[PDB]
Amino acid sequence: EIMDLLRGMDARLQHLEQKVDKVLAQGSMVTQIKNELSTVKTTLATIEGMMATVKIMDPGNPTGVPVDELRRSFSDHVTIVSGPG
Amino acid sequence: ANEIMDLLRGMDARLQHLEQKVDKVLAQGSMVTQIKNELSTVKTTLATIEGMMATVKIMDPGNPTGVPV
Amino acid sequence: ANEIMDLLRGMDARLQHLEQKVDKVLAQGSMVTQIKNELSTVKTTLATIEGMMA
Amino acid sequence: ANEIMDLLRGMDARLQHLEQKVDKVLAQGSMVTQIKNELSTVKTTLATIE
Amino acid sequence: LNEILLPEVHLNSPIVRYKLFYYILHGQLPNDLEPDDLGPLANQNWKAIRAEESQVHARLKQIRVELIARIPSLRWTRSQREIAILIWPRILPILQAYDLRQSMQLPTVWEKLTQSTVNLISDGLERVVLHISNQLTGKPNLFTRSRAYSIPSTRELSQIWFNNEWSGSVKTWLMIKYRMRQLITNQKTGELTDLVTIVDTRSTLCIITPELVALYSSEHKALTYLTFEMVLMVTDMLEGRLNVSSLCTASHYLSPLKKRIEVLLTLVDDLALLMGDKVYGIVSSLESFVYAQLQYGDPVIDIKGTFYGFICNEILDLLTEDNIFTEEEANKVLLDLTSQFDNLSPDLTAELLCIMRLWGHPTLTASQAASKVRESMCAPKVLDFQTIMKTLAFFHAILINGYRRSHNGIWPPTTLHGNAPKSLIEMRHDNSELKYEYVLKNWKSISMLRIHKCFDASPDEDLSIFMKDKAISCPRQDWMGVFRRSLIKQRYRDANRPLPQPFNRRLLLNFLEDDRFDPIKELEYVTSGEYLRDPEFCASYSLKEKEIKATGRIFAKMTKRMRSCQVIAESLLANHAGKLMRENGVVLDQLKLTKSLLTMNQIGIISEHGFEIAACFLTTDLTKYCLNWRYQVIIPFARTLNSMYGIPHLFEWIHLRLMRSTLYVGDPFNPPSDPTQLDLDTALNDDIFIVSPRGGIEGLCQKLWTMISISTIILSATEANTRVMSMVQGDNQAIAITTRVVRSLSHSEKKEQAYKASKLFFERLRANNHGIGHHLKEQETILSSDFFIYSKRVFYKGRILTQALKNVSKMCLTADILGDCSQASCSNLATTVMRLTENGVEKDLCYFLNAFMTIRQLCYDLVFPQTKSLSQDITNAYLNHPILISRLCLLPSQLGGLNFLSCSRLFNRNIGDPLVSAIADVKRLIKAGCLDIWVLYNILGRRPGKGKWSTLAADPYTLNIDYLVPSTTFLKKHAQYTLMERSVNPMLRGVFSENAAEEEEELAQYLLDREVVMPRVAHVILAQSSCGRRKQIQGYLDSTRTIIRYSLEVRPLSAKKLNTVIEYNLLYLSYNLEIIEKPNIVQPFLNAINVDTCSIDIARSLRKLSWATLLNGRPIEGLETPDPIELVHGCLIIGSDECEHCSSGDDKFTWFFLPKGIRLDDDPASNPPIRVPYIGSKTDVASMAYIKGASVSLKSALRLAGVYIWAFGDTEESWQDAYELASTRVNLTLEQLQSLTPLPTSANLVHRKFTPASSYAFSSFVHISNDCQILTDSNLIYQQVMITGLALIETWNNPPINFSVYETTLHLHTGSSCCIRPVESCVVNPPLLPVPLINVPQMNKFVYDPEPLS
Ligand SMILES: [Zn+2]
Ligand SMILES: [Zn+2]
């Protein structure tokens, strides 16, 4: 029983060793993801900064082009949602 | 006799080594917790960006719109 | 021949310790499955806004 | 005695189960490759905004 | 029919330059008009136009040949003659040259008659006011303390009104207007003969034609032409100048303004002659310079003189714009203009805002009017998206807070975005108040938050909105029908197209004659997007009348469907979403509004009797805001309002429809310059067209814009961490920035600290307004530490400035309304006199002026007959006996006379019983000597008129005297009845019935023919019954001149009705001749009534005999109310004096105390503490079950049942009788009616723009205490006593007086008076008559509700 008490133990143990070497890659990939997501925070801060202060201007009709031509606008109501929806 | 004791001693030592390996692996999860905490703000800020973009798009006078219901 | 019993109780003790640490490790793995799901949603909405900007 | 050999067969069976789900943990690597791909896309597309 | 639809007496339409040019060119009249001046009219084929209209061309040729014959030099061309042809704006300095005094007798006869009539009653009125002062104060110098100078009586008023300057001009233009109106009336009838009138006065030749007049002055060698509207405007301006100058001459208060106003008039008349139509820019600059001069006295150095300098620079630019004057001449003109505003009190500096209408109005051109809006609108605009979303977030916060504080403090259905923080999560869960400081942070999360359906709002919730007539434009195919046919006929013949059909429809008539009408399906026009796809839609502008500013010279009109959608949307916004905003103090009650404004202005004044409270006031006008609204700054707010109301796409309609449509200015004499522009869509962005508008329209969608402005103001206030109270008005706004300063600081330093604190708020407000697209210039912004501007009224240091001259300027000689009766004109004059009393003018002088102008109006109506009558017996009887004229003019309107201003009306607005006040006035006149006791006996013994139960119940307090109702209201009621009869709208299916008069008479008899008659109870029950509701709905119609004309056309009046409407004035004069001529023989028992009899007893007896036919001796109860002047016997205590009544028996008094040392417009520490004065108390029930959301029908039925039970008894028979009168409006059974009925005790019996009752100058420092008195009739009596005491205190120290060196105490001893009587009611009153069979509109929703409970 002692042989049995050792041989399978060593075999399982070697399997554990292999799985452990596989698992230590977790820490590495996880910290790389952490840093990359930190860069995502850095760039998302800038994209809000740019989007928060944006100019929306209506060109108007200073040229005096006839209204027939200026008729490039849809005439059908379309239901779109923004935040709530 | 004493050889079986040598074997048991070596196993317990080997399990101790693995035990250090697994407690290190467990300690690795704190920064996973931090990355979850930051993905929180990820979703929040992304939703804010989406909402801004949507309300900018609806602001175009060319296409009449309407809130559902 | 009692030492054998003493060491055996010791192996049981480190054993329980392995059980608890491995169980919480499984909890960490379950929480990374959550993370996976949320970031999936982040990808979906990012794709939506990429469609919207163009 | 034999009781602890039986118990240890029990604990190594549980151990094999732990390794079973451990093998399932690594499945995240493809999706994290996807998340890096997301970064690349968002960088390329925020380049357009400026 | 043409004798009723007479030409208008006063200006109501814009002055069109091209109309006068068309008339001048039609007849080849001599002129020096340049080809550029004629505009499009130069290239018109005048040969064809003269071929048509031959009567018009014949008349014009006749006046031209008369001008040539009289002045041979006019044949000379190339302006080589000495005669200069001048258009209206350049004839201002030569108005006094036109005299026509000779060959003109009617004005002289009118003046002589007025003088002769006034000479008989001046002393009597002086005695009357002396007795009033003695009775109300115990001293004979109540009205003459501030003036003692000279006391102007009625004779003095007439002398200085008929002998001052502009009097001859007013008489010569009144004669000209009368003759031209006669000619127009003759031309309408088709007389076609003698339609040209020549006066040929020496040195002044005038030729009158139904189209235009030709005035030539030999002294100045200037000939001018004036159209009918120009003549009306000139005579209105001359009448205003006469009134203003005469009032300045009369009142000691306004004496300093006379010379300044005269000099200003002369200077601007010369400027008008030298410039043209550009002098009205200078007039508007003077309007702003009034406020600039007001700001010149500000304690803060940084804010004093900024507006003054800016306005001076603007005036210099206007003067030197066209190089008429060089720099030095413009500087001299500016100095002369500004020197008239210096060294004036703040009150007078605001009463120089009367001169705006004193220079007439400019001649308008459609192209010039369109140029301004095309410059402002249709312009690129850069908007800040961060500012838009911050404003939207604060809009959400204000809406949520307003939905809270109501609806049991529960948040509206809202959806939270994914970014919302945990604090927002818990606040939505908790439903707590959204703190504005919290909302400032996390504004991204406050925004993007949707408020789901909050209201079950229905478009047909309000019925009055659909019954108001609005101008509607023609379809896009008949858009050329507005122009004159003669001008467009050649263009349409050249293009070979059919002539457009003229459009004359009205929105009210379209709504009334609509078979299938439903607001639910009407709003689908905007909801479904059909408006964007509608090709027939056409929106057009039209020139606005009596407008001098460049902005606001046009108002827009839209198609029927679009206008209906607009009014429905505005009503939807105002009913539910508008009520959610309490940040601004706007309320439908004027009393609460003026109280709020008084408190806001009195924030800064704190006396010495820590950290004090300081205020800096900021006022900006929003007139130009409408053109600057863009779709991108209103889309999110309107998107949230759509979600809240549940309608997917209702708002944002104005911009979406405007960008797709081409707008134009519709003027009959202003066709497009290019004759080839036959269609609207392909027009260019020039001339009268506005291609692709991108802004808003004034008035349209005003509620949404006001809410957006409120949100912006709140955002700015929180951004600077300053406390403010906004008061956005739509066209104006006032902000009071509040900060805490040290008490020990000097007032100037506290004001400086307040300005420094408000600087950051102003910067943030300007930044936010620029972000949302509204740039704020120096014109809009007025920063003052003392005053803010609201409703064209200045709130200076806790007061309201008088602006009485602006009220006196519009006191003309005839009401513009249709009937043109003497009674209507006298009522208008009395109303203007009441305004003068409220606005600081001497009460004694106001009484004298009311009497004088009543006499003047009656004399004018007698000697200037509107309609020629075959029999002149009445007119000759009145003309030959001026004593009859005086007796009729001094008789109160309740007794048949033309005196519409009672003596007690001079002090308190609220009058309880008009008949008691009339009797008191008659007694006062008898005691003085103005009238005679036999006149009172004749009134008592007068034969009862043709009155029924319906007139007694509908209008209580009225005697049974014929011709107390002017023909004007008869015409209005006839128009309303005609509109109701032909109405086919589903919403009014059962409102109209042929037996409505019979039903009303039967119900009034049922309620009144009892043991004890209660006219007030019957009136309330009738009003709250079904028939009263139908009468109210029928009275909802506006009944405008166009509506009256349409009703007279489609439903012509009978010959007898026509004759009585035409000769109502003569019939009324003849009817009153039976009492104002000789002492009639009366019953002997009437001699018990004397001049010492209490007015209440006389009123009771008079009501008993007057209604003797109806009542057969039963007395009338529940009407009598003590006359405020006669009820109280006041005494004034100065220094060591004592109250005689207090020392002799009487111990009831209303305590009024005025401290000493008060000095207005001085250091707030010196004078006693200030407070909001008593301005009045409005309605303010303990019902068994408090039903929420009860319909109008349910409330009406409950009030009817309560009043019936309280008055006629609490027996079960009375309950059954009231059950029917309640079931005529609801479907309750007896049990629910009894349970839901409010408490039937102490019935109020109450039933039926910004005009403050006084300046509140010295009434703010007053002290009141009614502890020593008994204390809803008693409450009204005590309120009237308090208001009378406040008015007495105010008139003791008139606006000429600004200090009080001694403390004054007023008592107003209401005790020991005969007018105080116990009140008894709630007696048993059996019906005495079966309940009439009443037809109820069961199917009508607005009258009957089958389900009054949920
Ligand atoms: Zn007293
Ligand atoms: Zn009395």
Residue numbers in the entry:
A (entry chain C): 220 to 304
B (entry chain B): 218 to 286
C (entry chain E): 218 to 271
D (entry chain D): 218 to 267
E (entry chain A): 4 to 151, 158 to 618, 658 to 1228, 1232 to 1299, 1308 to 1330, 1337 to 1415
List sentences from the manuscript:
L and P function as the RNA polymerase complex, responsible for replicating and transcribing the viral genome. To catalyze the RNA synthesis in both replication and transcription, L sequentially consists of five domains: the RNA-dependent RNA polymerase domain (RdRp), polyribonucleotidyl transferase domain (PRNTase), connector domain (CD), methyltransferase domain (MTase), and C-terminal domain (CTD). P harbors an oligomerization domain (POD) for self-oligomerization, and the oligomeric P attaches to RdRp of L, tethering the polymerase to NC to extract the RNA strand for both replication and transcription. Here, we resolved two L–P complex conformations from the mumps virus (MuV), a typical member of nsNSVs, via cryogenic-electron microscopy.
The other conformation has CD-MTase-CTD averaged out due to the structural flexibility, with its RNA tunnel inaccessible to MTase, unfavorable for genome transcription. Following the same strategy, Lbody–P was determined at the resolution of 3.01 Å, and only RdRp and PRNTase are visible in L. The missing of appendage in Lbody–P indicates the structural flexibility in MuV L–P, as in other nsNSVs. MuV Lbody–P owns a flexible appendage, and its RNA tunnel is inaccessible to MTase-CTD, which is unfavorable for transcription. However, the RNA cavity formed by RdRp and PRNTase domains is available, with the potential capability for genome replication. MuV Lbody–P takes an appendage-free conformation but still owns an exposed RNA cavity formed by RdRp and PRNTase domains with the potential to another replication state for RNA synthesis. Models in (c, e) are the composite atomic models of MuV Lintegral–P and Lbody–P via rigid body docking of individual models into their respective composite cryo-EM maps, which are B-factor sharpened. In both conformations, parallel P tetramers are revealed around MuV L, which, together with structures of other nsNSVs, demonstrates the diverse origins of the L-binding X domain of P. Our study links varying structures of nsNSV polymerase complexes with genome replication and transcription and points to a sliding model for polymerase complexes to advance along the RNA templates.
